[PDB]
Amino acid sequence: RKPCDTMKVGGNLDSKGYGVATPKGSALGTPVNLAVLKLSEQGILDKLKN
Amino acid sequence: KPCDTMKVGGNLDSKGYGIATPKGSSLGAAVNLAVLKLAEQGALDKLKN
Amino acid sequence: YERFVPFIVVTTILESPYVMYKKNHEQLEGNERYEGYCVDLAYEIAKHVRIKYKLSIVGDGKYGARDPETKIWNGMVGELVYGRADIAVAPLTITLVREEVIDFSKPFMSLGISIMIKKPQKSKPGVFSFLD
Amino acid sequence: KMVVTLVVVTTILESPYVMMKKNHEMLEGNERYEGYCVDLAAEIAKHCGFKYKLTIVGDGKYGARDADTKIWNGMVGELVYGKADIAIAPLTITLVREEVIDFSKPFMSLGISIMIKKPQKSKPGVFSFLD
Amino acid sequence: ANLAAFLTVERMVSPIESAEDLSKQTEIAYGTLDSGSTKEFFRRSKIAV
Amino acid sequence: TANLAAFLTVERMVSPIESAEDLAKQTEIAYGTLDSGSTKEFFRRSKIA
Numbered sequence: 001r002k003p004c005d006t007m008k009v010g011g012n013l014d015s016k017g018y019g020v021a022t023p024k025g026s027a028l029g030t031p032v033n034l035a036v037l038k039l040s041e042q043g044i045l046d047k048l049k050n
Numbered sequence: 051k052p053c054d055t056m057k058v059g060g061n062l063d064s065k066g067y068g069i070a071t072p073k074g075s076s077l078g079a080a081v082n083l084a085v086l087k088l089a090e091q092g093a094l095d096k097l098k099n
Numbered sequence: 100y101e102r103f104v105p106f107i108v109v110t111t112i113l114e115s116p117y118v119m120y121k122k123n124h125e126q127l128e129g130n131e132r133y134e135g136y137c138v139d140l141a142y143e144i145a146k147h148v149r150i151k152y153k154l155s156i157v158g159d160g161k162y163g164a165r166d167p168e169t170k171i172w173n174g175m176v177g178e179l180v181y182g183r184a185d186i187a188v189a190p191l192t193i194t195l196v197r198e199e200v201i202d203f204s205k206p207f208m209s210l211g212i213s214i215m216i217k218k219p220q221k222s223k224p225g226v227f228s229f230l231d
Numbered sequence: 232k233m234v235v236t237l238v239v240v241t242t243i244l245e246s247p248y249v250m251m252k253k254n255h256e257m258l259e260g261n262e263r264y265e266g267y268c269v270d271l272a273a274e275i276a277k278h279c280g281f282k283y284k285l286t287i288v289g290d291g292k293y294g295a296r297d298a299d300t301k302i303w304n305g306m307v308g309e310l311v312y313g314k315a316d317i318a319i320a321p322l323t324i325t326l327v328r329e330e331v332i333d334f335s336k337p338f339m340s341l342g343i344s345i346m347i348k349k350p351q352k353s354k355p356g357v358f359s360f361l362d
Numbered sequence: 363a364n365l366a367a368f369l370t371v372e373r374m375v376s377p378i379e380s381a382e383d384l385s386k387q388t389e390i391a392y393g394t395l396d397s398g399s400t401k402e403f404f405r406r407s408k409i410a411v
Numbered sequence: 412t413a414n415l416a417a418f419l420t421v422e423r424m425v426s427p428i429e430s431a432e433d434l435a436k437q438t439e440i441a442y443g444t445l446d447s448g449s450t451k452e453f454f455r456r457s458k459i460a
């Protein structure tokens with residue numbers, strides 16, 4: 001972002017990661033996770049990241 | 051050895067290894083809670099170091 | 100003798116670049132008021148499943164926490180537990196204390212703790228630097 | 232005298248995950264192997280309280296489903312066909328493996344990197360006169 | 363002074379820094395394994411780089 | 412001549428910060444985190460010295 005005056009250095013320090021939240025015991029959670037895996041293997045996450 | 055290589059650049063994709071269990075197993079959720087407990091306490095990074 | 104024999108709210112919070120309002124946000128209605136990463140993520144989930152949704156906004160501004168006194172989860176976690184929402188697509192950190200109350204899918208975007216510096220430039224002048 | 236009256240944990244040899252010991256022929260039981268995943272399974276058994284059995288995969292394959300037989304091989308086939316109980320090994324969590332078995336959260340995240348050599352001193356030569 | 367500066371530190375750097383450097387040049391070659399998910403990742407990629 | 416050589420020797424000194432051990436090795440440039448969050452809970456409940 002502007003004024004383009006910062007930078008990120010070094011590698012990551014911990015194992016952090018975001019996922020999709022769903023209620024416990026929900027029957028619809030498994031196709032959501034399958035769709036997440038399909039979007040991961042399809043590379044569309046990298047496309048939205050770029 | 052011979053300490054003659056090096057790795058540069060950022061990672062290209064999102065890869066990750068986890069504990070596998072057969073489908074419909076009752077142990078998978080406590081094993082996953084144990085994995086999350088080992089991740090939050092930093093013992094995994096200790097074994098990585 | 101035998102037996103009894105028988106015979107979508109999506110919540111998020113305003114975070115950049117995940118959920119951002121449009122420029123002419125007052126000139127539209129419905130789920131098209133907002134844009135960003137998580138909006139496109141929810142549209143792709145609805146494309147790969149085929150169920151219509153509804154984008155809602157969490158009121159309190161809190162992500163999720165359980166007080167030691169009240170034992171009440173706040174924010175989107177309290178919306179999922181107490182049934183105020185149906186599904187949450189938001190950048191929430193998957194922790195040990197959150198897995199025991201609600202489930203999570205596999206993590207799609209990994210990250211870590213970063214270091215921010217001033218990023219110095221090589222602003223070296225001319226005649227002013229020769230008499231150094 | 233007084234006369235009486237009368238969990239399968241599979242993996243594969245990978246460094247530094249599963250490595251051979253020095254006196255591997257002079258040991259027995261689960262103490263023959265050592266590495267990262269051995270201590271990982273030890274922490275799992277510490278925080279879960281169950282007996283383990285460190286076993287070796289037969290074919291040495293990770294997992295693949297043939298288009299003809301539709302049969303998974305390796306530790307994936309061990310978990311599907313009931314030959315094993317739980318697999319603690321660096322096995323890649325994919326979509327096609329989710330359709331047959333389950334997985335936990337990824338404890339170790341990674342990606343594709345670039346392997347180059349360390350830069351040694353190269354001969355500069357004729358460019359040294361005007362360097 | 364500058365010749366002493368080059369002879370003093372001798373901190374030579376790596377020629378490749380970013381992931382686009384393989385697309386930027388062609389003198390130093392690069393390859394992957396003949397079989398595996400890496401070849402499917404590069405084959406089924408959508409990024410033009 | 413010697414002073415300009417010394418200044419150019421200064422000119423190619425220590426690389427910028429690239430690790431947490433680089434932060435631990437210095438004390439001139441200070442650093443901070445957010446006043447609340449699991450970031451501060453990571454450092455408060457840490458085990459790595």
Ligand SMILES: *[C@@H]1O[C@H](CO)[C@@H](O[C@@H]2O[C@H](CO)[C@@H](O)[C@H](O)[C@H]2NC(C)=O)[C@H](O)[C@H]1NC(C)=O
Pocket residue numbers: 025026027
């Ligand atoms: C009325 O009650 C039935 C019975 O519990 C509810 O149906 C359940 O819905 C959940 C949703 O995940 C399923 O996991 C269960 O298997 C369902 N049970 C049966 C017997 O089918 C239904 O949702 C309730 N109606 C509401 C809440 O409007």
Ligand SMILES: O=c1[nH]c2cc(C(F)(F)F)c(N3CCOCC3)cc2n(CP(=O)(O)O)c1=O
Pocket residue numbers: 245293294321322323324397398399400
């Ligand atoms: O499930 C899989 N898990 C894998 C695990 C590993 C590792 F754990 F690192 F040993 C490796 N290697 C990568 C480099 O070191 C040698 C072997 C390959 C794997 N492959 C083959 P891919 O298709 O190329 O990923 C899989 O399929």
Ligand SMILES: O=c1[nH]c2cc(C(F)(F)F)c(N3CCOCC3)cc2n(CP(=O)(O)O)c1=O
Pocket residue numbers: 114162163190191192445447448449450451
């Ligand atoms: O559940 C949490 N989810 C969070 C998600 C995010 C974001 F990345 F925006 F999604 C952030 N930010 C990253 C840094 O800039 C400010 C906002 C903070 C979060 N925090 C606070 P933490 O505890 O300090 O990490 C949480 O608690």
